[PDB]
Write an enzyme that holds these catalytic residues in place. Structure first.
Site, PDB file in Angstrom:
ATOM      1  N   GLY A  10       0.812  -1.199   0.000  1.00 20.91           N
ATOM      2  CA  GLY A  10       0.000   0.000   0.000  1.00 20.91           C
ATOM      3  C   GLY A  10       0.849   1.252   0.000  1.00 20.91           C
ATOM      4  CD  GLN A  15       3.229   8.956   3.996  1.00 21.44           C
ATOM      5  OE1 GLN A  15       2.204   8.539   3.461  1.00 21.44           O
ATOM      6  NE2 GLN A  15       3.455  10.246   4.201  1.00 21.44           N
ATOM      7  CB  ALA A  90      -5.373  -0.833  -6.530  1.00 20.92           C
ATOM      8  CB  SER A 131      -4.250   1.466   4.951  1.00 22.56           C
ATOM      9  OG  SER A 131      -4.501   1.561   3.561  1.00 22.56           O
ATOM     10  N   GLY A 135      -6.766   0.697  -2.075  1.00 15.18           N
ATOM     11  CA  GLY A 135      -6.971  -0.306  -3.105  1.00 15.18           C
ATOM     12  C   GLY A 135      -5.876  -1.352  -3.112  1.00 15.18           C
ATOM     13  N   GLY A 137      -3.702  -1.640  -0.426  1.00 13.65           N
ATOM     14  CA  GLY A 137      -3.661  -2.107   0.949  1.00 13.65           C
ATOM     15  C   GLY A 137      -4.783  -3.052   1.323  1.00 13.65           C
ATOM     16  CB  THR A 170      -9.068  10.140   3.334  1.00  7.81           C
ATOM     17  OG1 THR A 170      -8.473  10.758   4.483  1.00  7.81           O
ATOM     18  CG2 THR A 170      -8.410  10.677   2.077  1.00  7.81           C
ATOM     19  CD  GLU A 245       6.884 -15.838  24.572  1.00  9.24           C
ATOM     20  OE1 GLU A 245       7.047 -16.823  23.824  1.00  9.24           O
ATOM     21  OE2 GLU A 245       7.833 -15.234  25.112  1.00  9.24           O
TER      22      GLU A 245
HETATM   23  N1  LIG Z   1      -1.679   7.464   9.622  1.00 14.47           N
HETATM   24  C1  LIG Z   1      -1.373   7.393   8.331  1.00 14.47           C
HETATM   25  N2  LIG Z   1      -2.344   7.055   7.412  1.00 14.47           N
HETATM   26  C2  LIG Z   1      -2.048   6.979   6.094  1.00 14.47           C
HETATM   27  C3  LIG Z   1      -0.763   7.239   5.653  1.00 14.47           C
HETATM   28  N3  LIG Z   1      -0.756   7.093   4.313  1.00 14.47           N
HETATM   29  C4  LIG Z   1      -1.996   6.745   3.902  1.00 14.47           C
HETATM   30  N4  LIG Z   1      -2.813   6.681   4.996  1.00 14.47           N
HETATM   31  C5  LIG Z   1      -4.244   6.326   5.025  1.00 14.47           C
HETATM   32  O1  LIG Z   1      -4.573   5.409   3.999  1.00 14.47           O
HETATM   33  C6  LIG Z   1      -5.919   5.611   3.629  1.00 14.47           C
HETATM   34  C7  LIG Z   1      -6.195   5.127   2.215  1.00 14.47           C
HETATM   35  O2  LIG Z   1      -5.236   4.169   1.836  1.00 14.47           O
HETATM   36  P1  LIG Z   1      -4.053   4.626   0.855  1.00 14.47           P
HETATM   37  O3  LIG Z   1      -2.721   4.125   1.351  1.00 14.47           O
HETATM   38  O4  LIG Z   1      -4.069   6.130   0.742  1.00 14.47           O
HETATM   39  O5  LIG Z   1      -4.405   3.976  -0.570  1.00 14.47           O
HETATM   40  P2  LIG Z   1      -3.610   2.662  -1.038  1.00 14.47           P
HETATM   41  O6  LIG Z   1      -3.640   1.614   0.044  1.00 14.47           O
HETATM   42  O7  LIG Z   1      -2.195   3.040  -1.399  1.00 14.47           O
HETATM   43  O8  LIG Z   1      -4.372   2.160  -2.359  1.00 14.47           O
HETATM   44  P3  LIG Z   1      -3.924   2.770  -3.776  1.00 14.47           P
HETATM   45  O9  LIG Z   1      -3.816   4.270  -3.671  1.00 14.47           O
HETATM   46  O10 LIG Z   1      -4.931   2.400  -4.836  1.00 14.47           O
HETATM   47  O11 LIG Z   1      -2.573   2.202  -4.134  1.00 14.47           O
HETATM   48  C8  LIG Z   1      -6.144   7.103   3.765  1.00 14.47           C
HETATM   49  O12 LIG Z   1      -7.444   7.358   4.239  1.00 14.47           O
HETATM   50  C9  LIG Z   1      -5.123   7.546   4.790  1.00 14.47           C
HETATM   51  O13 LIG Z   1      -5.782   7.917   5.976  1.00 14.47           O
HETATM   52  C10 LIG Z   1       0.223   7.579   6.571  1.00 14.47           C
HETATM   53  O14 LIG Z   1       1.370   7.815   6.202  1.00 14.47           O
HETATM   54  N5  LIG Z   1      -0.085   7.654   7.912  1.00 14.47           N
HETATM   55 MG   LIG Z   2      -1.534   3.824  -3.302  1.00 12.45          MG
END
Ligand SMILES: Nc1nc2c(ncn2[C@@H]2O[C@H](COP(=O)(O)OP(=O)(O)OP(=O)(O)O)[C@@H](O)[C@H]2O)c(=O)[nH]1
Ligand SMILES: [Mg+2]
Ligand SMILES: Nc1nc2c(ncn2[C@@H]2O[C@H](COP(=O)(O)OP(=O)(O)O)[C@@H](O)[C@H]2O)c(=O)[nH]1
Ligand SMILES: Nc1nc2c(ncn2[C@@H]2O[C@H](COP(=O)(O)OP(=O)(O)O)[C@@H](O)[C@H]2O)c(=O)[nH]1
Lengths: 430, 43, 610, 426, 427
Positions: A10, A15, A90, A131, A135, A137, A170, A245
């Protein structure tokens, strides 16, 4: 000799892991060049030229974020082939990461895991950062768990995923991609730790004295919990709890394995000088509802089991006095079939400070991993979103047009229904 | 005759990581956004 | 009190178009520098400067006889700006012309010293015609450019004293002045289907054709007799970033300077490059000397070049920082070198001849504070991106970079005597100590009490204590051994500097409240307060190694020399064009070298022997 | 490496697009000569999206410039930014369409597409991984509505698995400058709703409306009216070329934005709009930019957003800023304006933040609005047809080129269906 | 923290208000540009009450300029501190109101209120904790009276629980400069009594008599009369911007001086006013000021206090002083003037002391009085309307635009309702 494999998929997992892997370098004295000037072997691999390389895999179908790491500060630390990039994202579709684009690159992702796992003398488990709302994740997490469990039959699985917040949201197709992941990760994962984005915004505000928190503030603080859950494998202490454990004493039933996480003390530099860091106060801050890292009320539910992960200069006498105060409180409630619920794990290494962070230099820390029944309120909130949106059949043609059938939408609601009804059946006292 | 050295990475102003500067001066806020329940934010 | 002598001037303003102009006597050259204007003799290198102008100048106009000098200025929105008359001989201002709101863009002189023309800025966009003899003459205001983009460059005719033209973004127009009616008649020229954006204008001696320099690289020729476009630029190999400076010789052809730095000699038609040379930065000023056998080229990175026309060999003349100079430091044990740092650039100077020796370029960032290590092996410099850096003296190699040192960037920094500790100050209020190792750079403790920037850090000779000056109004002495403060100094002042007395008992602080105050390190109380200036704040302040004399500098452009015990000014030097920020008396007490916010470095002779 | 194909047809599309290339060559630091001159390395990292590398270090834009009349190609080539285009991408006929949809689609338009689609298919192979198509045209004319929606029908028969970004200027009643606008408007929206996945409609009155009271301009010429469209047009894909804390490409939007296959007619906007007098007195903050986007005065289409319910909304940011304040008042505006948004779709707004704001500014924001108030834009065209087809006026210019009268009744029938779908959900 | 939104409606309030933004910009050390140039840090540490900060360290005021004529709007921009404002707050019409109450309220000003309220409410959502509003107008004309009560009526229905601080110059019997002046005042008092929490009465002939007896001014132009009003303007809110020993907010002043919901018209004042000649012959004390508080000259209204009774009296002090001398001097004066103050209320005086005096003067105070003698300002307006309405003079202009004859008797009944309430609480 004890090893751990880290998988990132993801945008969130990559990040977060940029702020997770900046900590391991300074803890063991490893430069970003990859060169020091046997506790590091759990996270780094020795090479005959005296260069240490991380044992982590970065996967994202979208190539925008991994091109930052390849051209950024850490271009000489990571292995060039451990940075796997696709061609196109995605885009908030679970099928675009699970049926069309998640099918082409799944053989290269599983090839590098077999390359890393062969070098490990003793392998313990997996730590996966992603996450639920994305998409990739949600897509590329789901079939990787389907394929990893076939290959590695019974290795432990720990997920540190971003839960969607109740109000601050978001993406727009969030309730669809949340349900479709838990039909997979319920039976192909053994313990899933949850955090969200709203509850770390305010903790960054009331405690850290920061008015405007970014994602760089959140990912650093989640980078500190992972270094505290691992700390027994990395350093010696009074009594150690390892990855085998506490994944077996936090899962009482095969279907109820969804705990929470919190960290304490979380104090800025100015407040920490005045305030007296005592073991009784730190463990009392963990049980407050205002210091939860997930937007939920723990008072409504009852804890099933708990875990304590202490660090630094701490003695086990006043810890047992500190646990005795918690057991006599009336707000904290336990379910009747668990008279013994607490864990104790003590490490001798104090917490570290990052030049560039906003946490203070403290003498001790703790982490808590709480299995509660108050998470069923959070999922009942989100399956409410599913029924109201699916009633008008909105956004369905983007799903069937990329591989799945429409019948999966109904049967994934059947799984979250049966998951929800199990929480009330276990929280009722006998 | 001037010996000149070049940084290989031409970095940008917009890609700087850190805390975000408040629009108001650190001495006095044009709009008082206090900390919730009294106090002052660090600057 | 006596006038403090000045030794030499280095500095130049290159951002203005056609800033460098040669006075017709071919022995003097005038260039703009900050609020004032400066004149340099080419041969004898004697400096003469003109006092005036509310703010920084923006345009220059020199008469062909040279007996009048005129220059404009910039001013805030809604307020008028002044155009000042001058003489070359006695250097006295004649009258103030203060009509256009906002900045003045261009000016020109008639060939027979009879008329002057102006052009209002983006606020006004008007044209006002002046005659010198009455000293205050307004012909008429025709609003210059009509609908579509404004005009920027105005020049006046060569043979006759009647017509002038304005060119701009898609606008070219030829006026016509009638003497008895006192009126100017617009006549917009037609370019066909071509719409371009011009930067420079050059007019032939015979007034047949005058050329234009477009942003597309094309060179446009138009004849005001027929009021039609006459030629188009090169069909291929067009110059990059357009034509930023153009010039035409008496015989014919063109001298074209592009925004990339290319200097091309070419003749219409074809505009093919015969003899080519590449100069540093964007050429904005081309001016001939005499008949054109030798000439000068002024660039926008303040690199003034001397080019011989007969073979095209360039000779660099003067360099400075095109942005504001931030800091100055002298190495321990010597005074023949000093390093000045600014935005994007770090330089190393030679004190005796003002000749540069090293340029370390970190692009797109600003370098606030510079300090030297006592062994002389690494030059420590603060930066804006939050990363402390250290550089080698000879080759300029980056020895180490320290990432994420401060949240809001590093402001000021100081080094200890035994070359083992580094203390930095940042805008977030944190004070950090950096232990220097042969392979690592570590962080020991973070001292967070300040809630504003850290202007300057001064360490003792015994390394037991250090003091930090802050814009908060709190000045703190730190115990470096045990890492905790002892005494705090509070005032209603935004401090900008602090210096230790050589006997180490007393410190003095100055700032925006303009009171030089004596302080005690035992309890933090104030004893004596002296008003250094009554209008502008004091920024730079330094004490010599004996404790007898200390100097001050600030927004009032005043170089004052004081007595420590008496507290009265004994020398005053007035030569600055911009605000002073840093001052440093050289080791051996030979020179007083000062920096300015307009990019000029001035070296004064130290008056006493102490 | 996710390349975008630019199509440029009509007279209005040629003027906006040739000024659309004026902005995104400034942001990437590309000279009108052709070489690159920038100050940051992030602009050169993704330069293949809009530009093709060529010999000598020079870049040429990937756009196809088509018009049946050479009356404007001599104007684009003789502009400030006209020497960067390829000499072989100027595909033109000799006789103009003359504000007829029949000439642009059947007689003049059926003979030039073999020269147009031959270069578009040729430029599609030069891209490594094609991402989608974008087109600039006008519905109220004869070439852009005539041949542009002919090109929509032909490329979508070749590249089905792609995305489409039509940037079209809608006819306006008060700023009506042609008498055959209700004929040429109804003949393209029968093709736009069926073979286009996101249609951003732009209006001429609203662009004049913004120049009057927002920027306080008394002479809004065409040389600066197309800048505002060009500013929003460069903000849709600011994450596909630049890094950020939450990246969003073109398919990232369309999954969030299209619940039903034929509800995709959008509305755009650009956020930091101020005058010159109020430049110095203005606070450039994230809470300030959010109020500007959701205002009715700063919409670029002649619809009142209060008269119809928003379905889904974008908010694409640029510049260094915290995601808490981006997520704070974009949670409030769903709650304060709860009647404006819909009740069966939670989280109507999607936030995406980049890291590079444009030149001459420190922040940015681009607004994209799917609303049910767009039906009033299409209602006035529908009622203009009824009073004109009743008397059968201007029909011999149409039936004298190849069509019957059955297309006119059928095009109004699908006009009635499109406006019918929005009112059900309101 | 606590915030004030300022409005400038009518010709009388615009030049007073444009002098009001000049006094406080001098106290706060703000240049006519808007860049800070001050001496002490107490000037800037509470600036958000009246000002807004712009980018680059520039400060702009929170005021909205409105008038139906654009002639007087361009008089402000050419003033000393005219370039500090913002151009999006400039809302004006094209046609004059004609000093007609029905033109500024019913016909011509009824289209601009959509444009003035969208910018009044713009500055309020940017606010964090709004205390109240501050509007300057007059009761004599048709622009500042008809439109002035229109703005007050439309802002209470949006923000119910706030406080209005309207600063109204009242008609004068000898200084009448309008012939329809009694008609304009009685129509506006119908709204200010019902829906305003504080209204100040400023009389023109009281400002002249002060200028000739106390200051001994030879040439009292309108540039100097607004300076006396602006001094009281800044003294009321000085406990909201500066530290003080006995702090008193604006709603602190609301509870103290308003016993009943229809008695809120206060006579204001100032304290260290002296001529040029008697500077060295006068000695600065706090018992000086108390004997200067109750001078019949020193009030800004032509209602002599001995033809009434005092309900509540306030006096906000500025400078360095002790507190026994403050409060004992407002105990001795009630014992001396026993019959003048009411008997049914003990301790008629509310006091306040601050720490920052005005520039150039070591110590200063601001006087606020509530008396029953203000019925004389209201009886004569009711008498002047009565004789004019008996023959229906000047009425065919007002009745031709929408509002009829019986509305004049409605406000006259309410006007006579009020002057009985002063009398019934007097005895
Ligand atoms: N806390 C935190 N949340 C994050 C971060 N990066 C993305 N998110 C969360 O990820 C959610 C959506 O997932 P994304 O990672 O943006 O999308 P993705 O999983 O990359 O899917 P694609 O964009 O299609 O590749 C958002 O609502 C954000 O809140 C981060 O660095 N820290
Ligand atoms: Mg992405
Ligand atoms: N806002 C704006 N509108 C334009 C521009 N150029 C053309 N138009 C509009 O386009 C409409 C006519 O369409 P036209 O260009 O003739 O289409 P064509 O006949 O197919 O080439 C007119 O109503 C104009 O308002 C432009 O640069 N800006
Ligand atoms: N203090 C002061 N009062 C003024 C000034 N100009 C007019 N007035 C008073 O205003 C009263 C008339 O009000 P008017 O101007 O008709 O109100 P309008 O209808 O809002 O314009 C007169 O009785 C004057 O005493 C001024 O500059 N200063």
């Amino acid at each position: 000799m004890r090893e751990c494999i880290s998988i990132h998929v993801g945008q969130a997992g990559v990040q977060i892991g940029n702020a997770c892997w900046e900590l391991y370098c300074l803890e063991h004295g490893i430069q970003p060049d990859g060169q020091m000037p046997d506790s590091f072997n759990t996270f780094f691999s020795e090479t005959g030229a005296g260069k240490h390389v991380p044992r982590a895999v970065f996967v994202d179908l979208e190539p925008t974020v991994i091109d930052e790491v390849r051209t950024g500060t850490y271009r000489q630390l990571f292995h060039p082939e451990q940075l796997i990039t696709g061609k196109e994202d995605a885009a908030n579709n679970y099928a675009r990461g699970h049926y069309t684009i998640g099918k082409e690159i799944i053989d290269l992702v599983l090839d590098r895991i077999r390359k890393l796992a062969d070098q490990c003398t003793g392998l313990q488990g997996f730590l996966v950062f992603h996450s639920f709302g994305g998409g990739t994740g949600s897509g590329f997490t789901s079939l990787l768990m389907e394929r990893l469990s076939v290959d590695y039959g019974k290795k432990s699985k720990l997920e540190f995923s971003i839960y969607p917040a109740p109000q601050v949201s978001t993406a727009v197709v969030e309730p669809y991609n949340s349900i479709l992941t838990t039909h997979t990760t319920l039976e192909h994962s053994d313990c899933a730790f949850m955090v969200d984005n709203e509850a770390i915004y305010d903790i960054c505000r009331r405690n850290l004295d920061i008015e405007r928190p970014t994602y760089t503030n959140l990912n650093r603080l989640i980078g500190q919990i992972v270094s505290s859950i691992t700390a027994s494998l990395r350093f010696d202490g009074a009594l150690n709890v390892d990855l085998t454990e506490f994944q077996t004493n936090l899962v009482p039933y095969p279907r109820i394995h969804f705990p929470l996480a919190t960290y304490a003390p979380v104090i800025s530099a100015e407040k920490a000088y005045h305030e007296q860091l005592s073991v009784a106060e730190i463990t009392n801050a963990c049980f407050e509802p205002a210091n939860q890292m997930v937007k939920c009320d723990p008072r409504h539910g009852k804890y099933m089991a708990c875990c304590l992960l202490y660090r630094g200069d701490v003695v086990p006498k006043d810890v047992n006095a500190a646990i005795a105060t918690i057991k006599t409180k009336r707000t904290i409630q336990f379910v009747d079939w668990c008279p013994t619920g607490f864990k104790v794990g003590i490490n001798y290494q104090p917490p570290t400070v990052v030049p560039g962070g906003d946490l203070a230099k403290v003498q001790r820390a703790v982490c808590m991993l709480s299995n509660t029944t108050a998470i069923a309120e959070a999922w009942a909130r989100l399956d409410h979103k599913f029924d109201l949106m699916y009633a008008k059949r909105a956004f369905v043609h983007w799903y069937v047009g990329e591989g799945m059938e429409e019948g999966e939408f109904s049967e994934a609601r059947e799984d979250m229904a049966a998951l929800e009804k199990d929480y009330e059946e276990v929280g009722v006292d006998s | 005759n001037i010996r000149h050295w070049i940084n290989p990475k031409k970095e940008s102003i917009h890609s700087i990581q850190g805390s975000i500067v408040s629009p108001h001066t650190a001495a006095t806020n044009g709009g008082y956004s206090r900390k919730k329940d009294g106090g002052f934010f660090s600057t | 009190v006596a006038e403090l002598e000045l030794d030499a001037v280095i500095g130049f303003n290159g951002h203005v178009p056609t800033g460098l102009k040669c006075h017709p006597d071919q022995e003097h050259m005038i260039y703009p520098l900050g609020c004032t204007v400066l004149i340099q003799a080419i041969n004898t290198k004697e400096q003469n400067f003109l006092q005036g102008h509310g703010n920084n100048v923006s345009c220059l106009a020199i008469s062909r006889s040279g007996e009048y000098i005129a220059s404009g200025q910039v001013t805030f929105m809604g307020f008028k700006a002044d155009i000042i008359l001058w003489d070359y001989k006695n250097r006295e201002l004649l009258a103030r012309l203060s009509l256009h709101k906002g900045k003045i863009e261009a000016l020109a002189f008639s060939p027979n010293d009879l008329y002057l023309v102006s052009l209002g800025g983006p606020d006004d966009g008007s044209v006002v015609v002046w005659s010198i003899a009455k000293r205050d003459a307004i012909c008429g205001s025709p609003a210059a450019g009509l609908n579509v983009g404004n005009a920027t460059n105005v020049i006046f005719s060569r043979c006759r004293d009647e017509m002038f033209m304005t060119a701009g973004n898609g606008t070219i127009r030829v006026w016509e002045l009638d003497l008895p009616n006192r009126k100017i008649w617009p006549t917009e020229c037609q370019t066909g289907q071509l719409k371009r954006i011009v930067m420079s204008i050059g007019v032939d001696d015979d007034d047949s054709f005058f050329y234009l320099g477009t942003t597309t690289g094309d060179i446009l020729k138009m004849n005001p007799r027929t009021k039609l476009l006459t030629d188009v630029g090169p069909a291929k190999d067009k110059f990059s970033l357009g034509v930023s400076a153009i010039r035409c010789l008496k015989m014919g052809g063109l001298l074209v300077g592009s925004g990339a730095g290319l200097l091309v000699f070419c003749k219409s038609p074809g505009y093919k490059p015969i003899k080519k040379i590449q100069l540093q930065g964007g050429i904005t000023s081309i001016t001939l000397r005499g008949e054109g056998h030798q000439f000068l080229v002024g660039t926008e990175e303040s690199h003034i070049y001397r080019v011989s026309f007969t073979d095209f060999k360039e000779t660099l003349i003067a360099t400075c920082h095109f942005d504001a100079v931030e800091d100055i430091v002298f190495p321990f044990g010597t005074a023949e070198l000093f390093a000045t740092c600014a935005k994007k650039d770090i330089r190393v100077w030679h004190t005796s001849s003002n000749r540069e020796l090293l340029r370390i370029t970190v692009p797109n960032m600003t370098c606030h504070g510079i300090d030297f290590m006592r062994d002389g092996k690494s030059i420590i410099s603060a930066w804006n991106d939050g990363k402390i850096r250290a550089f080698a003296p000879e080759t300029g190699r980056l020895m180490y970079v320290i990432n994420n040192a401060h949240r809001i960037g590093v402001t000021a920094i100081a080094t200890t005597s035994d070359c083992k500790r580094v203390i930095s100050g940042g805008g977030e209020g944190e004070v950090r100590v950096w232990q220097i190792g042969c392979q690592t750079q570590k962080l020991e403790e973070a001292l967070k009490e300040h809630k504003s920037s850290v202007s300057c850090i001064r360490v003792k000779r015994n390394n037991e204590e250090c003091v930090t000056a802050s814009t908060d109004g709190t000045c703190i002495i730190w115990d470096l051994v045990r890492l905790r403060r002892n005494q705090m100094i509070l005032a209603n002042t935004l401090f900008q500097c602090v210096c230790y007395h050589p006997e180490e008992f007393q410190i003095i602080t100055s700032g925006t409240d303009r009171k030089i105050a004596y302080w005690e390190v035992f309890d933090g109380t104030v004893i004596r307060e002296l008003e250094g200036s009554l209008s502008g704040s004091i920024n730079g302040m330094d004490i010599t190694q004996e404790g007898v004399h200390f100097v001050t500098g600030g927004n009032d452009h005043l170089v004052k020399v004081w007595d420590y015990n008496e507290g009265e000014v004994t020398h005053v030097g007035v030569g600055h064009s911009g605000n002073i920020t840093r001052i440093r008396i050289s080791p051996g007490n030979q020179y007083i070298v000062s920096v300015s916010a307009d990019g000029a470095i001035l070296r004064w002779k130290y008056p006493y022997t102490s | 490496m996710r390349e975008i194909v630019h199509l440029q047809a009509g007279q209005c599309g040629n003027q906006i697009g040739a000024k659309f290339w004026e902005v995104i060559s400034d942001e990437h630091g590309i000279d009108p000569t052709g070489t690159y001159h920038g100050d940051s390395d992030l602009q050169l990292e993704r330069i293949n999206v809009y530009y093709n590398e060529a010999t000598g270090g020079k870049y040429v834009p990937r756009a196809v410039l088509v018009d049946l009349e050479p009356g404007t190609m001599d104007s684009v080539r003789s502009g400030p930014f006209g020497q960067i285009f390829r000499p072989d991408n100027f595909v033109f006929g000799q006789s103009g369409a003359g504000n007829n949809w029949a000439k642009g689609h059947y007689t003049e338009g059926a003979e030039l597409v073999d020269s147009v689609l031959d270069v578009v298919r040729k430029e599609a192979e030069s891209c490594d991984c094609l991402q989608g198509f974008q087109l600039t045209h006008s519905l109220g004319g004869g070439t852009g509505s005539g041949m542009g929606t002919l090109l929509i029908s032909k490329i979508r028969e070749e590249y089905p698995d792609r995305i489409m970004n039509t940037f079209s200027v809608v006819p306006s009643p008060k700023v009506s400058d042609t008498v055959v606008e209700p004929y040429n408007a109804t003949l393209s929206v029968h093709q736009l709703v069926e073979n286009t996945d996101e249609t951003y409609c732009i209006d001429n009155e609203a662009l004049y409306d913004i120049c009057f009271r927002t920027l306080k301009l008394t002479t809004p010429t065409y040389g600066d009216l197309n800048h505002l469209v060009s500013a929003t047009m460069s903000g849709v894909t600011t994450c596909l070329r630049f890094p950020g804390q939450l990246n969003a490409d073109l398919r990232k939007l369309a999954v969030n934005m299209v619940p039903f296959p034929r509800l995709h007619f959008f509305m755009p906007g650009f956020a930091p709009l101020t005058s010159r007098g109020s430049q110095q007195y203005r606070a450039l903050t994230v809470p300030e930019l959010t109020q500007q986007m959701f205002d009715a005065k700063n919409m670029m289409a002649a619809c009142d957003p209060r008269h119809g319910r928003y379905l889904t909304v974008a908010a694409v940011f640029r510049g260094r800023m915290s995601m808490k304040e981006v997520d704070e008042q974009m949670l409030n505006v769903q709650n304060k304006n709860s009647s404006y948004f819909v009740e069966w779709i939670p989280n109507n707004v999607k936030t995406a933040v980049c890291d590079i704001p444009p030149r001459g500014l420190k922040m940015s924001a681009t607004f994209i609005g799917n609303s049910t108030a767009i039906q009033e834009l299409f209602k006035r065209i529908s009622e203009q047809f009824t009073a004109m087809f009743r008397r059968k006026a201007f029909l011999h210019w149409y039936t004298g080129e190849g069509m019957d009268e059955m297309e006119f009744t059928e095009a109004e029938s699908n006009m009635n269906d499109l406006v019918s779908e929005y009112q059900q959900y309101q």
